[PDB]
Design a protein around this motif. Sequence first.
Motif, short mmCIF file in Angstrom:
data_model
loop_
_atom_site.label_atom_id
_atom_site.label_comp_id
_atom_site.label_asym_id
_atom_site.label_seq_id
_atom_site.Cartn_x
_atom_site.Cartn_y
_atom_site.Cartn_z
N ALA C 48 0.83 -1.19 0.00
CA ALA C 48 0.00 0.00 0.00
C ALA C 48 0.87 1.25 0.00
O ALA C 48 2.03 1.21 0.43
CB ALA C 48 -0.93 0.01 1.22
N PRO C 49 0.34 2.37 -0.50
CA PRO C 49 1.13 3.62 -0.51
C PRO C 49 1.63 3.99 0.88
O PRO C 49 0.91 3.90 1.87
CB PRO C 49 0.13 4.65 -1.04
N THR C 161 2.32 4.20 -5.91
CA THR C 161 1.05 3.75 -6.45
C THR C 161 1.00 2.23 -6.38
O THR C 161 1.99 1.56 -6.70
CB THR C 161 0.88 4.22 -7.91
N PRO C 162 -0.14 1.67 -5.97
CA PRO C 162 -0.24 0.21 -5.86
C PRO C 162 0.01 -0.48 -7.20
O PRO C 162 -0.20 0.09 -8.27
CB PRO C 162 -1.68 -0.01 -5.37
N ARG C 164 -0.76 -2.83 -10.15
CA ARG C 164 -1.95 -3.32 -10.84
C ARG C 164 -1.51 -4.28 -11.94
O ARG C 164 -0.94 -3.86 -12.95
CB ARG C 164 -2.74 -2.15 -11.42
#
Lengths: 523, 499, 507
Positions: C48-49, C161-162, C164
Amino acid sequence: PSDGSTANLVPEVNNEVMALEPVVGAAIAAPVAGQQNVIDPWIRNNFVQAPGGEFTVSPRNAPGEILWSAPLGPDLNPYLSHLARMYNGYAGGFEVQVILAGNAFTAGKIIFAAVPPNFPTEGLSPSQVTMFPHIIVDVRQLEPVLIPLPDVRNNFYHYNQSNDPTIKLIAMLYTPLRANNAGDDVFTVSCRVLTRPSPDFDFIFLVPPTVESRTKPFTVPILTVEEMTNSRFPIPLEKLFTGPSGAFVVQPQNGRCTTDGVLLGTTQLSPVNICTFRGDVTHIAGTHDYTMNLASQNWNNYDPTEEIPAPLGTPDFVGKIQGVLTQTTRGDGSTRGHKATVSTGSVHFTPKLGSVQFTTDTNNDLETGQNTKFTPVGVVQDGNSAHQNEPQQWVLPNYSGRTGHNVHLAPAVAPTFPGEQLLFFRSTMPGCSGYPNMNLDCLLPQEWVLHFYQEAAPAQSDVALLRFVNPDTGRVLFECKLHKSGYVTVAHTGPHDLVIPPNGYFRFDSWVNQFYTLAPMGN
Amino acid sequence: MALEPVVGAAIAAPVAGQQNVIDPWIRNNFVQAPGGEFTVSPRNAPGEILWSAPLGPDLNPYLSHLARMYNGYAGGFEVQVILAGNAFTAGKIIFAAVPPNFPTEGLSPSQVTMFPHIIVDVRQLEPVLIPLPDVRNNFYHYNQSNDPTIKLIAMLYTPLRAVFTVSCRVLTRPSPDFDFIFLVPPTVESRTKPFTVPILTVEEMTNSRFPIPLEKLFTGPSGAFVVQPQNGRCTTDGVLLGTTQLSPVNICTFRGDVTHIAGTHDYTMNLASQNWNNYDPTEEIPAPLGTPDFVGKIQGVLTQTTRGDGSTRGHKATVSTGSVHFTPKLGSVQFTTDTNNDLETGQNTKFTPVGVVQDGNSAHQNEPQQWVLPNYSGRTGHNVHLAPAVAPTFPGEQLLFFRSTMPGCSGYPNMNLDCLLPQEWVLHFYQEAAPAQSDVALLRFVNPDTGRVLFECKLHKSGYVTVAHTGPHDLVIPPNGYFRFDSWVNQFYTLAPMG
Amino acid sequence: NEVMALEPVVGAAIAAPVAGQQNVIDPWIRNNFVQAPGGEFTVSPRNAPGEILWSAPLGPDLNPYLSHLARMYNGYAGGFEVQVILAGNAFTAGKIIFAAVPPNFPTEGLSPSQVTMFPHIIVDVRQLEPVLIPLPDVRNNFYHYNQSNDPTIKLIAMLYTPLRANNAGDDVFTVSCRVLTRPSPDFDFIFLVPPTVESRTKPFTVPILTVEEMTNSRFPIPLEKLFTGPSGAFVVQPQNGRCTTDGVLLGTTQLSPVNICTFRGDVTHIAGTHDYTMNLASQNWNNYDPTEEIPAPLGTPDFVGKIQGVLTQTTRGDGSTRGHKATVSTGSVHFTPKLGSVQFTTDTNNDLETGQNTKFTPVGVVQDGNSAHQNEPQQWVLPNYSGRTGHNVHLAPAVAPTFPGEQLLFFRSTMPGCSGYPNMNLDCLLPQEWVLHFYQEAAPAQSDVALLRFVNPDTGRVLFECKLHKSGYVTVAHTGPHDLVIPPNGYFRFDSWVNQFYTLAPM
Ligand SMILES: [Cl-]
Ligand SMILES: [Cl-]
């Protein structure tokens, strides 16, 4: 050059440009400003994430939702935010940088638009936003989007303490987010907003720091869950709980406070007076019951004309609360203490009118002229009825009993975003007798009420994004939305007691709006 | 003219991370230092260092706020001193710049003249200007380091002849060579937030020695007693002392498993932690956190819940502190209850306090002696790891107490309960952890309607308050008055009389 | 874009007027990137950020060549060039921020917004070309001394940023990252000095000994297996075999592997019983001082149980010798070794004279067979070293894992049983030979955790990795009790000091 990275799968840069003319900054103000000031040039040459500065495009979002918005001002930049507490005014523009590096399997468009001062933003449609200077960007764009934000105005400069409007920058979802990654994954687009002041930006007048409200920054206390106390009963906190709230009505009146420090309902600051009563007491002939004529919490006469539902600290649930009545005689100092019980669902529980009825363990030994204090201890249940049915925390008592209805209530509270539930701070009330429902949930710990009250920090948007962190491991456990109305929400479905490290704390990360999509926490 | 020019941060450019600029207007206005108040009174004698300050951003409130944004600094100041004397006042003050790593301890007024100095008469009207250059042997200073800098010191050069206190103020502004160095985020762990005291009202705060609200402020003589409470004891920079903890509700409470004492209505409680963990009697504490810190009989209610069915039981109960069976350091305390049966053994039990009681056949108002500490390990030894005792050290001064009235449950108890700090002040100091720039924080109590200052008091770093008064007195305060932190001072500050 | 907003920073050139001499580094070392010892981290979708994935301070320990050279030099000055490699592909999304944190600024607790306020770079998870970061030697002196441990600039890697991405099957996609380093041109060493005298340059090592070849530190017996398990119910707080990485002994720990459960002193009979009281004398036969800031005399047993052995005695003038089966109960109220007295149960009430020196040689543990089987020897319960008359003082701290998924790693041996049905399990935190090794080779810890790799030398394969904490205990990535299945010739190898956020691969 892009072989094996990005792979042309993705828009590189935007061609579109905002149809805004150049706008002068603070130079125009020099002959009438008090002073000519200087900003550290490193602050001017380097992008930093704005307070706010996070937003998300998810499949739950619908076209037309403003995902991010901000007025021009020092609050656009964390360095400028701290500096602004030291200046009286400002003038000039910003350069904003937006990051939208969506996964290549995602689709959708965002419009950024500049709306001029004194135009209402509060109902804009996607069609209408196109009529301002605007840019349309693909959610997959790789290089950051650069938007210059000029300080359109009709005066030489702006005062921090006034409410003259500035240009607002808007980001709105123009096309819904679609995706065609084959697997069952989201691919939410996490977006970042960074800024730096334009060269024409400058502060105006040097002034004493922290004494101006509009520049006070928002914070959330570092205290741990165990170190805080319930705001609805004088008990420590024990766990964090989220659950579905569709059946019942979540409308407590204690522990209700807004982010910028306005108390609501029956909320007060003292965590010890949260179910106390003080006043003169009267015996009821033939019974062991006493009637209490209420004074205030500071032992003054009570004024029922106040725009409050009941005296501050009056219980906000229906149940039988057991405690102790204590009394002291002025002349000799004789003191008496007697087991006592108040039923808030009783027809004689009328604290708005100034009277409450207790059931005691004597019919004498309570004088009629002396000051008497109810110290609460716990809750009780009548053992012959259904187990765990007596204390209904989410049922408000009738503060004026059978006469009239409840007034000046704090609003009810519910999740508004798909997939979201309330996050409750849970405490377990002592039981004294019977089989009582001992769970007590509040929307804000009492220490948060204290903190928000003292630091009357204006909310930069309607939702403050918090992340809950384990300081031993450094990892984020879940993220949640703290609303200005004074309640927290999380992304989960179903009831769940949170599994939390004893050292966990809440960390404030960004301002967001109600359309922010939280990372799923559950299990 | 007595010192050479001294370069600031310009020399650091090859080894600093960045090149920065400070708003030049900040150096165009003399402004009062955060620790720019000191006093000359006839109680003072030559040899006492009445005022001192190290070179650094803390000399200037603007630089102080800016410092939260930078990692280091370099450069000097121009300091201005103002003395509020009158023509009937005689004596000389010497201000001197003493270079880093020279010991000030023991200096005579003669010796102080051997530094760069100025000798100013106490009756001068016009302010005096002192240059303060950043003499050092490194490129620059870090904010997070206690590396020593040049010090400015003020002391009586000739004895003062004059109740008449001379109020003095020190103002500063940065030299042109002063500059900050590395731009950095103002985080909480920096511990660069400046020290403050909550705006809360006395009426709206809570006692730190018993879970009850505050009621009034009280000053009195303490020669008879030993002022050594263990709750509501906290340092200005957020170090907890004694048995002090943060929850205002968990004061004077007990949690654990309970056991019947055969033939009586008395019970023994085996103490678990406040979190419902195991309690460790080997911790470096006088007793578990929240243990009562006075001798007396505290009445409350014992509460118990059986897991599985939800059975709940509640019984009036009473703890006698200073009883031989009050041994919380060892892990057990004894209650007297209103039953000999219904308290089950297996289940967890909580004592919720309510008030104190007094044996009516003895002298009235004699049972709860708030200034007598219990013996935390009973007869099997004496108390350890105590918070220090507290007494006024400056002539004419008494402690200032935050006074509340304990509920009485039966008898004629002494319901007076004085604490050294409100529980909310303990919370604030813990969270803010502001480092103390001197040993005494001067606070003034303000009426917010008019802006008027009603009295001043000294908040000592050790976490206790003293004020200038003689005799017992309940203070008469506007209900909405608040405390304001005004300046760092030292032990020689002479407070205005109050009463 | 890819440029960190840092001014140039002079290296050792500024120090020439004040350095004693001018030195030269082998140019190959300057032209070739080398992996920092703990220069690996991973980006997973669980991240997580704000999570700090990796950190390091500037210094010679980032480069094994420079680390070896520093042992023969007095100081250094200058910066490094860092190369970070990202193993992404075009189908990923997410951003990582690298940031330069200045010398005395705390990293602890930073939010993502705030990390952006340092000089920084934002790197996309899809970037193929390695990222080049200059790491300048920001400081306030001319140069650094090896022995003064000056604080330096830190590199920070944080998830911005997570991630993806899709997964393939049940294998979850992750982006592996590696950090490489090489000295800047302005870096240089300062003063040639004798190559291994300076303490703060000695590197940390772990014995090559095999589990079978090592010895338990809590009882004079060899080790047998490695065991990991959950420890939430009980309190893991041994007092023997407790030693810190840089060689400070803790608790009741001492160096001799044979004196681990021994007693020596003069003995006295208790009338009418088969019990004897021993007036304890120090293990080195000297007068015993109770004032010592120790829980008990060194080598005192650290568990509750009955230890059976043999009492031995020697008459000085005649030279006679006596030996009798004996047993010590550590939970008995007469076991007060902190005060100087211990009680034995022997097989004779005669033939043990006074004034003569007597040594208890331990052999094993015993159990009362009429009680519950495997209930008498409680290894994780400390005895009360002062009996009833007080509490234990100056204990080594208790030990527990702090990371989700991690459990203690115990060095397990099986105690000899003499009678009954005793719990013969004995777990120590450190082998006695590791205590010996750390004590002599007093290498400073470069962080709170030493990453170890356990290697099977037959195949060359690494079986697992574990974290050796500075406080002297080991943790592994596992859940549930488990005896480790290890090749008989497997050994522990030291890999690197790492930061407290380093996440180790599960078994
Ligand atoms: Cl900040
Ligand atoms: Cl003083």
